[PDB]
Amino acid sequence: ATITQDTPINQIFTDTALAEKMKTVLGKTNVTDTVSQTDLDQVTTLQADRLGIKSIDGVEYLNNLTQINFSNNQLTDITPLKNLTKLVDILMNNNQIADITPLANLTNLTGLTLFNNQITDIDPLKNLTNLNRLELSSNTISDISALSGLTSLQQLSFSSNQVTDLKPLANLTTLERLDISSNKVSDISVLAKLTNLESLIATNNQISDITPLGILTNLDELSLNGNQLKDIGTLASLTNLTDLDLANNQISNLAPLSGLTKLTELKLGANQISNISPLAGLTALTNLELNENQLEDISPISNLKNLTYLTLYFNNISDISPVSSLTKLQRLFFSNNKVSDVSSLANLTNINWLSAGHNQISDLTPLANLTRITQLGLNDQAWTNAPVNYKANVSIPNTVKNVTGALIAPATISDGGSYTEPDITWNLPSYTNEVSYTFSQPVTIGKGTTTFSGTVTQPLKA
Amino acid sequence: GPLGSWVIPPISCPENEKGPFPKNLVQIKSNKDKEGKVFYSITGQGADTPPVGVFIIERETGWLKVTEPLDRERIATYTLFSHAVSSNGNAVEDPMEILITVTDQ
Ligand SMILES: [Ca+2]
Ligand SMILES: [Cl-]
């Protein structure tokens, strides 16, 4: 393709925004300035991302292009690329591309990026057999049969599509990094063939059987977050794992994890775990997530000295003290537990985020010196005091203490009760099984601000 | 402030990363998700203002992802804001400030 004679830039590149870009690339000072075919032939690369480009009409005259970036534009038609066979790499994610037929004869392509488009039919990719990187996330693809002959692929992603059948991956043994997240996958048997895999991301699918992973011993990163896992016996084989995400499944037995001592990050939130003894020897862990389980005894955590990030929220934990030795902790989340005594938290001197809402916390004084706090959560505590004798007039000490050591006055007191520091008093004409009070006090520790609030239940004993 | 019911791991991303893109950084969560489904979004420089869409979040899962290789000599830190909503329309959280640090290759 060649322009017949010298033509104004804005007659070649009809797109207002591409014209301006080409003016700069071609060294001219105005869009109406004329350019020759020899000027056009000098352009070998083009960075034209995020410019609000709606058409690449004109690009077919840029014969020598080897690399293009048109990502984050408003492209639909990519017809002008059809004959640009010197193209080695294309970045074209975040457009509105529906038809990739113009890519079919671009056989020197080694990298092709097309995520966030409107692509359904990937048949035009079938002869692009030099591809080593292919990215197809967030399209409407349901058939990956066109991938079957792409035998040089090392990196492949098609997350956020409508794919059920992985059989076309069978012969792509060069694969090292695969992402199949958010598809319709239940059967991962074909993956047993991809023995060079180092990373497999497969979150948000319908996987229950992970036996095909057994011989994928080169895996260092595995994500099976949001599936239907229970039996994780196979993972014992994966001795190279450093990063493992198994959150949102049905796992109870953690014994297969006990030998995975290379692990630095481990996510087990939202499962059926009651026993964390198998995690005791995983001392290289910096991140550990254990939220939304059925934990009470967290003592096996005390050994994990390298932890900087830990979640424990939504469990049945009364005793938080096994965290005391985790002196590198920077973020700790334990909302929705049964913790009253936070004396051990005084040891976590590098704590920055402390989320402790929905516990049984009455006294903030052990936290007074934690001045590296930037995020704090102390809302909606609730506890029941040891019963006191029901009397015509009952008096109890207020036990709610701010970080300063001072008592926090009740916000409300049930049954028309009153407060005279330090005592809450009720006049009770007849027998009642319980009385209660609430408190709500904004508080800052360091630079972390929260409302320290709760409901205190006082059973009355006859 | 305000922390609310957000659960956010610290976020760093090495510069000059290899694909495939987009790549998962961290999964963001609101405790409001066990009392109904939550839907996530992000704002800020690198998200909805220039450079747009360097970072994206998967609406239903909270997975925060990076879409291209980074360069510490261009942008070394990004400040993002996450948002959480139900089925519904509310707003089960106030926005959370999210720092992302670009680190060594
Ligand atoms: Ca959840
Ligand atoms: Cl989780």
- Which one of B7, B32, B64, B75 would you mutate to disrupt binding with A, by most A Cβ within 10 Å of its Cβ? B7
With an 8 Å Cβ cutoff, are A448 and B24 in contact? no
Domain boundaries, chain B: 1-105
CA distance A5 to A8: 10
**Half-sphere exposure of residue A210: CA atoms within 13 angstroms, side-chain side:** 24
Q: Across the interface, which of A94, A181, A333 has its CB nearest the CB of B53?
A: A94
d(CA A292, ligand 2 centre) in Å: 7
Q: Are B12 and B98 in contact (CB under 8 A)?
A: no
CA distance A319 to A341: 8
Peptide bond into A102 cis (omega under 30): no
DSSP one-letter string for A81-112: GTT-TT--EEE--SS-----GGGTT-TT-SEE
**Half-sphere exposure of residue B72: CA atoms within 13 angstroms, side-chain side:** 11
Superfamily of domain B1-105: Cadherins (2.60.40.60)
Query: SS3 for A409?
Result: coil
**Chain B positions in Cβ-Cβ contact with residue A267 (cut-off 8 Å):** 27
CA distance A321 to B32: 27
With an 8 Å Cβ cutoff, are A313 and B53 in contact? no
CA distance A393 to chain B (A): 39
With an 8 Å Cβ cutoff, are A287 and B31 in contact? no
Cβ neighbour number for residue A338 with a 10 Å cutoff: 16
Nearest by Cα to A190 from A163, A217, A172: A172
Q: What is the DSSP letter of B91?
A: B
Q: Does A161 contact B at CB distance below 8 Å?
A: no
Q: Which two tokens stand for residue A62?
A: 């840029």
d(CA A139, ligand 1 centre) in Å: 26
Q: Across the interface, which of B10, B51, B61 has its CB nearest the CB of A203?
A: B61
C-alpha angle with apex B10: A297 to A137, nearest 5 degrees?
Answer: 105
Q: Are A304 and A279 in contact (CB under 8 A)?
A: yes
Q: Which positions ≥6 away from A171 have C-beta within 8 Å?
A: A148, A149, A151, A193
Look up tokens 């322009």; give the residue.
Answer: A3
**Chain A positions in Cβ-Cβ contact with residue B19 (cut-off 8 Å):** 113, 133, 135, 155, 157, 177
Q: Enumerate long-range contacts of A11-15, CB under 8 Å, 24 or more apart.
A: A12/A40, A12/A58, A12/A61, A13/A57, A13/A58, A13/A59, A14/A55, A14/A57, A14/A58, A15/A53, A15/A54, A15/A55, A15/A56, A15/A57, A15/A58
Q: What is the DSSP letter of A415?
A: G
Give A67's strand partners.
A45, A89
> Which residues 29-58 of B are in CB contact (within 8 Å) with A?
31, 34, 50-53, 58
Domains annotated on chain A, with CATH: 1-380 (3.80.10.10), 381-462 (2.60.40.1220)
Q: Across the interface, which of B5, B7, B22 has its CB nearest the CB of A311?
A: B7
DSSP one-letter string for A107-124: TT-SEEE--SS-----GG
Give the chain B residue whose CA is nearest to the CA of A177. Answer: B20
Cβ neighbour number for residue A252 with a 10 Å cutoff: 15
Q: Across the interface, which of B19, B31, B61 has its CB nearest the CB of A135?
A: B19
CA distance A69 to A16: 18
The alpha-carbon radius of gyration of chain A (Å, integer) is: 31
Query: SS3 for A8?
Result: strand
Q: Which positions ≥6 away from A175 have C-beta within 8 Å?
A: A153, A154, A156, A169, A194, A196, A197
